[PDB]
Amino acid sequence: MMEFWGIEIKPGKPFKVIQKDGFMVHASQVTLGDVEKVKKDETFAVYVKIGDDENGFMIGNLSQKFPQFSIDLYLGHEFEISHNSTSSVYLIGYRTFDLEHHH
Amino acid sequence: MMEFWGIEIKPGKPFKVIQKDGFMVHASQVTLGDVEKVKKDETFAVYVKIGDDENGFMIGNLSQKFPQFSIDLYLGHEFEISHNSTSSVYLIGYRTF
Amino acid sequence: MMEFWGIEIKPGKPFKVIQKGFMVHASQVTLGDVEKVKKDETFAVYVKIGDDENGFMIGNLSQKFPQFSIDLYLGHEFEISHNSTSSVYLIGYRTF
Amino acid sequence: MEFWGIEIKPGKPFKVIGFMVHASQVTLGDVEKVKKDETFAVYVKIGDDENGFMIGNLSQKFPQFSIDLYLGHEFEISHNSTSSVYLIGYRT
Amino acid sequence: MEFWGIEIKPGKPFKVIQKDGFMVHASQVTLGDVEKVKKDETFAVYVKIGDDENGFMIGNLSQKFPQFSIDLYLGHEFEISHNSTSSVYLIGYRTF
């Protein structure tokens, strides 16, 4: 019924998902990597661009003081996640399915 | 719960969302758009007004020190989001049945 | 998820709700007029159920932590109170 | 659905006996009066288990937290605050 | 539906194996012995899925931010690890 889903968005490398209509992910958590190594008083932004949109929406900020945040977000069949951290950012959640077996 | 939705509420500019399709917005997250671009110790209020009712309700506060919060809100029909920040505020979630 | 629901609890005025098949889901509690409250105070928010004389704390508010989210169902009869000098906004949704 | 709540008094673990509690919210009482910069731990023990799980910490700086927890037939909530802690949610 | 919880001891990744049809919903990650950990250090908490050698970060913990809530479903095989000197508690519920 549920499968774990997760991506590491590396610095300077937006993560693009291109799938068929009806593909969906529930994104739950966004976490800053290498907290000890990022510049101490900086805030980083995480963005989502939907479909062919040239402009994104901010989904939240990351910093030493707020180094992860929870969200209740559904992402559809075409999206791109980006951020401006020097560290990786981890976006995790789950897909939801019905299932039947023939044994 | 299968339609990403977001709006950017610009400073001084309430954002009206008018839904006539019987679906709703689930607001999930409220974020300050540019933490660097706000007065350092000030707190900003975010309001929602429902339909043509004149009374608004706070959905939360924002500041450089506390620049986002998660929420679980369903908003049908017509609503208006406003705030008094000098920065843009992003309300993000999904449209659902 | 049926419909937006919200109340403003004014200072010194506990807010009573009575319901029938209706449920209120409280989602968010927010401190009003943050700039005007004393910077070093914490305010307590209570719910009293039915005829109870004493409440349960649902949370604290302060200039430093001026709202909090919750996942609460409130049924037949409840009263929300707090000791802020400003209004407190409790919002969520009603279902049926 | 109905509202469910307990006040766990200082030094007094609170024992609860098909019915299920959803614990939603844990709040520190008398925030202004507890020790500055101290963190208090909240525990749950399930059934007859002698050793518990932490469900969270409370302090002046973080004086409540939300949780999504289902608790079954038999459990005990404890904490080490000098003030009361309020655990609320709903029963199903 | 039932309570589920594990204590991940320092230096000891905790491997969970489940039977077909079981799911763990992780709800809360809490730092133990907050008063004893290094004052200004941040600890990373990881989940490794199935046979993956590398984990995904699920969050950070510190004395200043000593727990976080999460909405995660975990399946057949997963491993939780962290680099704290104290235990970390992952709790939630199991369904079938």
Q: Which residues of C touch D31 (CB under 8 A)?
A: 42, 44, 60
Residue pair B89/B62 in contact by the 8 Å Cβ criterion: yes
- Establish how many alpha carbons lie within 13 A of residue D11's alpha carbon, considering only the half-sphere containing its beta carbon: 1
Indicate which technique resolved this structure: X-ray
Determine the residue among D1, D7, D27 to mutate to test chain C binding: the one whose Cβ has the most chain C Cβ atoms within 10 Å: D27
Which of E66, E71, E93 shows the shortest C-beta gap to D70?
E93
Tokens of A12: 């300077």
Residues A30, A34: Cα–Cα separation, whole Å: 13
What letter represents residue A97's amino acid? F
Chain E residue closest to A89 (CA)?
A: E57
Q: Which residues of D touch E31 (CB under 8 A)?
A: 57
Residues B29, B9: Cα–Cα separation, whole Å: 13
CA atoms D14, D20, D26, D28: torsion sign: negative
Does A2 touch chain E if contact means CB atoms closer than 8 Å? yes
Does D33 touch chain C if contact means CB atoms closer than 8 Å? no
What letter represents residue D81's amino acid? S
Tokens of D70: 């289902």
Residue pair A82/A53 in contact by the 8 Å Cβ criterion: no
CA E78 to chain A, closest CA, distance in angstroms equals: 10
Chain A residue closest to E25 (CA)?
A: A2
Tell me which H or E stretch contains A59. Answer: strand A57-62
CA B57 to chain C, closest CA, distance in angstroms equals: 6
Residue pair D76/D13 in contact by the 8 Å Cβ criterion: yes
Residues B10, B21: Cα–Cα separation, whole Å: 26
Q: Please answer yes or no on whether A57 and B92 come within 8 Å at the CB atom.
A: yes
Alpha carbon separation from B95 to D42, D90, E61 (Å, rounded)? 37, 27, 33
Residues C32, A55: Cα–Cα separation, whole Å: 33
- Establish how many alpha carbons lie within 13 A of residue B43's alpha carbon, considering only the half-sphere containing its beta carbon: 20
Does A94 touch chain B if contact means CB atoms closer than 8 Å? no
Does B84 touch chain C if contact means CB atoms closer than 8 Å? no
Q: DSSP letters of B68-84?
A: EEEEEEEE-SEEEEEE-
Q: Which residues of C touch B50 (CB under 8 A)?
A: 4, 6
Which of E49, E59, E73 shows the shortest C-beta gap to A2?
E73
- The neighbours of chain D, by the rule of 3 or more Cβ pairs under 8 Å, are C, E
Which of E3, E7, E31 shows the shortest C-beta gap to D71?
E3
Does D60 touch chain E if contact means CB atoms closer than 8 Å? no
Which of C3, C7, C28 shows the shortest C-beta gap to B76?
C3
Query: Distance of alpha carbon B10 from its chain centroid, rounded?
Result: 10
Tokens of A74: 């559904």
Residue ranges of alpha helices (H) inside C2-94 are: none
Does B60 touch chain C if contact means CB atoms closer than 8 Å? yes
Q: Please answer yes or no on whether B67 and A24 come within 8 Å at the CB atom.
A: no
Q: Which residues of B touch C1 (CB under 8 A)?
A: 24, 26, 74, 96
Radius of gyration, CA atoms only, chain E: 13
3-state secondary structure of C35: helix
Q: Please answer yes or no on whether E66 and D20 come within 8 Å at the CB atom.
A: no
Give the Cβ contact number of residue B90 at 10 Å.
22
Q: Please answer yes or no on whether A58 and B92 come within 8 Å at the CB atom.
A: yes
Residue pair C34/B45 in contact by the 8 Å Cβ criterion: yes
As for chain A, the residues directly before each break of C–N over 2.5 Å are none
Q: What is the maximal distance between C-alpha atoms in chain B?
A: 42
Chain A residue closest to B91 (CA)?
A: A59
Chain A residue closest to E40 (CA)?
A: A36
Alpha carbon separation from C54 to B82, C95, D1, D7 (Å, rounded)? 36, 27, 22, 11
Which of B57, B69, B76 shows the shortest C-beta gap to C89?
B57
Alpha carbon separation from D76 to B69, B92, C43, D53, D70 (Å, rounded)? 31, 38, 28, 11, 13
CA B56 to chain A, closest CA, distance in angstroms equals: 24
Angle, CA D86 vertex, CA D82 and CA D90 arms, to 5°: 165
Residues C63, B95: Cα–Cα separation, whole Å: 32
Angle, CA D33 vertex, CA D31 and CA D37 arms, to 5°: 70
Q: Which is nearest to D79 in space by CA: D32, D4, D17, D28?
A: D28
Residues D34, D64: Cα–Cα separation, whole Å: 14
φ and ψ at E38, to 5 degrees?
-60, 135
Residues A40, A57: Cα–Cα separation, whole Å: 25
**Nearby residues of D68 by Cβ (< 8 Å), 6 or more positions away:** C71, D22, D24, E25, E27, E28, E69, E71, E92
Residue pair C49/D3 in contact by the 8 Å Cβ criterion: yes
Does B70 touch chain A if contact means CB atoms closer than 8 Å? yes
Angle, CA B68 vertex, CA B62 and CA B74 arms, to 5°: 100
